[PDB]
Curated annotation (Swiss-Prot):
EC number from the UniProt entry: 1.13.11.52
Protein name in UniProt: Indoleamine 2,3-dioxygenase 1
One annotated GO biological process: quinolinate biosynthetic process
Metabolic or biological pathway: Amino-acid degradation; L-tryptophan degradation via kynurenine pathway; L-kynurenine from L-tryptophan: step 1/2
Organism of origin: Homo sapiens (Human)
Length: 362
């Protein structure tokens, strides 16, 4: 599963039944309007009964989903600017322990938010489920699981990243070449999986229901100063909503290939750098370690080796195809439904253009 939390935990200790009940019933609790009441009446539950990483991750997912639902409600503008103490304090304490900002992140609602139906059959969409959804019909299963499946497909390449760096230091030309071609292959497979967005996510539902609950409170006019995590911090805090930008897997190929997505002070680089603060510390460390290694790009550029250049450009091109396909996705799932905005398209186009500018041959 690469950087997905392998076999996520589904159930918390019974001590947390009141949390788990709210998170399991978000669609009708939000629908009826009883969600904010059930949060406001929660006892303050200590996080000390969360005894292992898996349970903490489940608990962070549970509380993150509750928090998104509490802040946004039905998503029609009646927001809550203060997260009640009895959830904000354990959420922030747990988030501090996991080193993640106390907002729902990609690693919660994708990497930790899934199960196999049949434990004894492969990781296919058909054999999988999400643990939590926000609203009936929000297509959170399709959106989260397809993101997960694209991540798993790409994560197969992570197995090969050590090969790349050791082939470079041991000067193993053929090993470096087959490694780069295998990475390109995984990125190409990831693109095919990517097409399953159309199979399982309806554009209307995503844009008008799901997107609401992934929104954050950074630069957000509805929560202009952030969210007050009551009884934990006195002043409100701004945190970005969930993004696949927060997947180290989806940032690591740019780092690997010396595509400097995070270089400079432009907004695209700043965003992608910022999104690393929402990755699990191990994931963020993986990226930093790649950034410290010798440049694969420079290696390939210095060898006067057309096969090596070809293998490198196959990786770069597969990244370009993913981002071009993704731009089509964004057109269909955001731009079109929004006309029923351009800062967004310019971000993705900037990132794609940085990608294609790294091609060795035009
Ligand atoms: C309904 C389907 C999708 C929509 C509407 C969508 C939308 C967006 C948006 C609005 C952004 C800008 C940054 C942000 O706001 O988070 C973005 C960036 C990004 N998305 Fe998606 N996305 C979708 C599916 C996916 C999937 C399945 C993946 C995983 C392969 C993905 C990977 C990324 C990545 C890695 C970025 C960062 C920019 C980049 O690396 O090119 N997106 N997407
Ligand atoms: Cl609890 C927690 C976990 C991770 C990051 C932060 C944070 C960063 N900046 C302000 N708060 C807070
Ligand atoms: Cl308050 C708090 C708790 C845990 C981690 C951090 C953090 C990470 N980076 C900057 N601050 C902050
Ligand atoms: Cl939180 C979350 C979960 C799955 C995918 C995304 C995403 C895709 N593109 C931008 N964000 C965000
Ligand atoms: Cl599988 C994969 C690996 C790296 C980046 C992307 C991607 C998709 N859309 C924007 N970036 C997808």
């Amino acid at each position: 599963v690469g950087f997905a939390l392998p076999n996520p935990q589904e159930n918390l200790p019974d001590f947390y039944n009141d949390w788990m009940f709210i998170a399991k019933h978000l669609p009708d609790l939000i629908e009826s309007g009883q969600l904010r009441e059930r949060v406001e009446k929660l006892n303050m539950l200590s996080i000390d009964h969360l005894t292992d990483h898996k349970s903490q991750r489940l608990a962070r997912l549970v509380l993150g989903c509750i928090t998104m639902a509490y802040v946004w409600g039905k998503g029609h503008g009646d927001v809550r600017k203060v997260l009640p103490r009895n959830i904000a304090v354990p959420y922030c304490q747990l988030s501090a322990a996991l080193e993640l900002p106390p907002i729902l992140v990609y690693a919660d609602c994708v990497l930790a938010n899934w199960k196999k139906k049949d434990p004894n059959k492969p990781l296919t969409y058909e054999n999988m489920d999400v643990l939590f959804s926000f609203r009936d019909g929000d297509c959170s299963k399709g959106f989260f699981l397809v993101s997960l499946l694209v991540e798993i497909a790409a994560a197969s390449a992570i197995k090969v990243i050590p090969t790349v760096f050791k082939a470079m230091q041991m000067q193993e030309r053929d090993t470096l070449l087959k490694a780069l071609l295998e990475i390109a292959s995984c990125l190409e497979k990831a693109l095919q999986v990517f097409h399953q967005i159309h199979d399982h996510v309806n554009p209307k539902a995503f844009f008008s229901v799901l997107r609401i609950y992934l929104s954050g409170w950074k630069g957000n006019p509805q929560l202009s100063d952030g969210l007050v995590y009551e009884g934990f911090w006195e002043d409100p805090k701004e945190f970005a909503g969930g993004s696949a930008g927060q997947s180290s897997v989806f940032q690591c190929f740019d780092v690997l290939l010396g595509i400097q997505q995070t270089a400079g002070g432009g907004h695209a680089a700043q965003f992608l750098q910022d999104m690393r603060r929402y990755m699990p510390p191990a994931h963020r460390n993986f990226l930093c370690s790649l950034e410290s290694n010798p440049s694969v790009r420079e290696f390939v550029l210095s060898k006067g080796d057309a096969g090596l250049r070809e293998a490198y450009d196959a990786c770069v091109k597969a990244l370009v195809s993913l981002r071009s396909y993704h731009l089509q996705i964004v057109t269909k799932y955001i731009l079109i439904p929004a006309s029923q905005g351009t800062d967004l398209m310019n971000f993705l186009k900037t990132v794609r253009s940085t990608t294609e500018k790294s091609l060795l041959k035009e």
